[PDB]
Design brief:
This is part of a larger assembly, with chains A and B.
Chain A lengths: L16
Chain B lengths: L8 H6 L11 H6 L5 H4 L9
Family (chain B): Belongs to the helicase family. Dicer subfamily.
Protein name (chain B): Endoribonuclease Dcr-2
Subcellular location (chain B): Nucleus; Cytoplasm; Cytoplasm, Cytoplasmic ribonucleoprotein granule
Chain lengths: ~15, ~50
Amino acid sequence: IDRYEQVSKDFEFIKI
Amino acid sequence: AGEQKCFDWELMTNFRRLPQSHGSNVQQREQQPAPRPEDFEGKIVTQWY
Protein backbone atom coordinates (compact mmCIF):
# COMPACT_ATOMS: atom_id res chain seq x y z
CA ILE A 1 0.00 0.00 0.00
CA ASP A 2 2.72 2.43 1.14
CA ARG A 3 0.34 5.41 1.01
CA TYR A 4 -2.79 6.47 2.82
CA GLU A 5 -5.57 7.01 0.31
CA GLN A 6 -6.15 10.70 -0.27
CA VAL A 7 -9.46 12.43 0.34
CA SER A 8 -11.24 14.82 -1.99
CA LYS A 9 -11.68 18.52 -1.24
CA ASP A 10 -15.43 18.55 -1.97
CA PHE A 11 -16.62 17.61 1.52
CA GLU A 12 -19.31 19.75 3.13
CA PHE A 13 -20.88 20.17 6.56
CA ILE A 14 -23.96 17.95 6.43
CA LYS A 15 -26.51 19.08 8.99
CA ILE A 16 -27.35 16.62 11.76
CA ALA B 1 -14.67 58.44 -25.64
CA GLY B 2 -11.43 60.26 -26.32
CA GLU B 3 -8.82 60.53 -23.58
CA GLN B 4 -11.54 61.01 -20.95
CA LYS B 5 -12.20 58.19 -18.49
CA CYS B 6 -15.44 56.97 -16.94
CA PHE B 7 -16.79 54.70 -14.23
CA ASP B 8 -16.57 50.94 -14.81
CA TRP B 9 -20.29 50.26 -14.51
CA GLU B 10 -20.19 46.78 -16.05
CA LEU B 11 -17.56 45.51 -13.61
CA MET B 12 -19.46 46.85 -10.60
CA THR B 13 -22.83 45.50 -11.75
CA ASN B 14 -21.19 42.12 -12.37
CA PHE B 15 -18.96 41.77 -9.28
CA ARG B 16 -21.21 42.56 -6.35
CA ARG B 17 -19.53 39.61 -4.60
CA LEU B 18 -16.63 37.43 -5.71
CA PRO B 19 -17.93 34.07 -6.95
CA GLN B 20 -16.88 31.22 -4.70
CA SER B 21 -14.35 28.91 -6.32
CA HIS B 22 -15.97 25.51 -6.88
CA GLY B 23 -14.54 22.59 -8.80
CA SER B 24 -16.13 20.69 -11.67
CA ASN B 25 -16.39 16.92 -11.91
CA VAL B 26 -16.04 15.06 -15.21
CA GLN B 27 -19.81 14.67 -15.60
CA GLN B 28 -20.63 18.38 -15.41
CA ARG B 29 -17.39 19.37 -17.16
CA GLU B 30 -18.52 17.47 -20.26
CA GLN B 31 -21.30 19.83 -21.34
CA GLN B 32 -19.64 23.01 -20.09
CA PRO B 33 -18.62 25.04 -23.16
CA ALA B 34 -15.08 24.73 -24.43
CA PRO B 35 -12.86 27.37 -22.79
CA ARG B 36 -11.78 30.17 -25.09
CA PRO B 37 -8.35 31.81 -24.85
CA GLU B 38 -9.92 35.28 -24.85
CA ASP B 39 -11.86 34.25 -21.73
CA PHE B 40 -8.58 33.52 -19.89
CA GLU B 41 -6.27 36.27 -21.17
CA GLY B 42 -5.42 38.77 -18.45
CA LYS B 43 -7.82 37.24 -15.93
CA ILE B 44 -7.59 35.69 -12.46
CA VAL B 45 -7.69 31.91 -12.04
CA THR B 46 -7.16 29.52 -9.14
CA GLN B 47 -6.36 25.85 -8.60
CA TRP B 48 -9.39 24.41 -6.83
CA TYR B 49 -7.95 20.88 -6.84
